[PDB]
Design a protein around this nucleic acid. Structure first.
Length: 437
RNA sequence: GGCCCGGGGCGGUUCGAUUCCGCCCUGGGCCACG
């Protein structure tokens, strides 16, 4: 029931068992043979090469080394040639440059072309650094792989593990750099309790200082922030989880939280209790990769949220979910309906000029003087949030993301009431409203 | 594709816009461990 105890039972949830490990060795050995028969220059990197991959995430990274003089085109052509020939099932994939993904003796494998260079500089593509990160880590992480795993397990269970845009959390590499700094998962957790949004961790210099943002310096490139895509709120959640963990060590922190669905009937009553306006903008999911989709859902969500706040509907929070089918932008506002009249501030009484131009606009109600300046009653074009968003989305679709916005332009609808509790968003809505139990 | 910083043009809204809402060009930087 104590920290040591808990961590020992946790090693079982984060450490691959012998069957997953053997499946990996047999796949690795078999892969070396295929690549060797072709006599290609390659290097195994990533968490597989270092035995730091989290249980259930066995993926082999094989980087093909190409001379500095080759064209980017050669790497992708040659790279595809080699990939195709060496994999049971292949499939082109894309990032900064195209590469090849596939399977060998039942395990996932990435085949990525990169330049063989020395000294982090000269780098041509982000992938060129991967080999350096490996050299710097292999020697220093040896003997601490289980600490890496406990950390990865901790982060993943609490939905903040990956560093891609859908998560904005802690990359694998970040976790290993952290273990090399603190020495173990516990020390990491203990010190993270004191992290701030100004904390800088420079592994190379074995130092922690104060910067302008949370910055973990890459041992291989001082100008690169290893935690660049770790959002402020996810940094905050980790610091809080760490405080709660040291206070009440539980094996639970390493177990994925159960979805725990809710009867759309309970949700209806809660929204009724709250007395707010809950609604969603539904539209078709653009066919794009998560890394392009989510930053867009975030933008579109924000833009609409911001419209709602200046339009005085008093938004509480926003959210969003994407299905294979559609995408949903959710909002909750304190104001279900606002009056049609509102007051426009006018010029001070002594400004004869502007006062005159202010009164020249025929309105329905006749302006008045208050506390020294003129004011006018004006009328709104809408009186509910839904009406507002309908107006906003129909005319500002282009500002919601290149793709998300193009999709809203051709089709979108606002849903609310019961018709909304039937949509696949109740989970998102419960998290958004703090529904507990 | 998203974010930050900078130029050159416009539309709308406003008594009043560099300063709100947005649209064209356009330079550089950064992110999605890789």
């Amino acid at each position: 029931m104590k920290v040591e105890e808990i961590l020992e039972k946790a090693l079982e949830l984060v450490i691959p068992d012998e069957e997953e490990v053997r499946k990996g060795r047999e796949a690795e050995e078999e892969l070396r043979r295929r690549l060797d028969e072709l006599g290609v220059e390659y290097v195994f990197v990533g968490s597989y090469a270092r035995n730091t991959w989290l249980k259930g995430s066995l993926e082999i990274d094989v980087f093909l080394l190409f001379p500095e003089e080759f064209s980017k085109e050669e790497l992708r052509e040659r790279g595809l040639e080699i990939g195709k020939a060496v994999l049971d099932s292949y499939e082109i994939r894309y990032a900064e440059h195209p590469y090849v993904h596939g399977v060998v003796k039942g395990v996932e494998v990435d085949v990525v072309p990169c330049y063989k260079l020395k000294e982090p500089k000269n780098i041509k593509s982000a992938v060129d650094r991967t080999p350096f990160h490996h050299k710097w880590l292999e020697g220093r992480i040896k003997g601490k792989e289980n600490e890496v795993r406990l950390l990865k397990g901790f982060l993943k269970a609490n939905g903040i593990y990956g560093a891609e845009y859908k998560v904005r959390g802690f990359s694998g590499y970040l976790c290993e750099l952290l273990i090399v700094f603190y020495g173990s998962f516990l020390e990491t957790v203990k010190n993270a309790r004191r992290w701030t949004r100004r904390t800088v961790i420079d592994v190379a210099k074995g130092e922690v200082r104060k910067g302008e943002e949370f910055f973990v310096v890459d041992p291989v490139d001082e100008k690169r922030n290893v935690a660049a895509n770790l959002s402020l709120d996810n940094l905050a959640r980790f610091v809080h989880l760490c405080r709660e963990f040291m206070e009440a060590p539980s094996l639970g922190f390493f177990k994925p939280k159960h979805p725990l669905e809710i009867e759309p009937e309970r949700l209806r009553k809660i929204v009724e209790e709250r007395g707010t306006a809950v609604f969603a903008v539904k539209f078709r999911k653009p066919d794009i990769v998560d890394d392009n989709l989510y930053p867009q859902l975030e933008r579109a969500s924000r833009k609409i949220f911001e419209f709602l706040e200046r339009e005085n509907f008093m938004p509480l929070r926003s959210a969003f979910k994407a299905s294979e089918e559609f995408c949903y932008l959710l909002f909750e506002c304190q104001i279900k309906e606002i009056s049609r009249v509102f007051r426009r501030m006018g010029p001070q009484f002594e400004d004869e000029r502007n006062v005159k131009k202010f009164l020249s606009r025929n309105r329905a109600f006749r302006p008045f003087i208050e506390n020294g300046r003129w004011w006018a009653f004006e009328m709104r074009k809408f009186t509910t949030p839904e009406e507002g968003v309908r107006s906003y989305a129909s005319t500002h679709w282009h500002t919601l993301g290149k793709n998300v916005g193009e999709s809203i332009r051709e089709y979108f609808e606002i849903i609310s009431g019961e018709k909304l509790f039937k949509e696949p968003v109740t989970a998102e809505l419960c998290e958004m409203m703090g529904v507990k139990d």
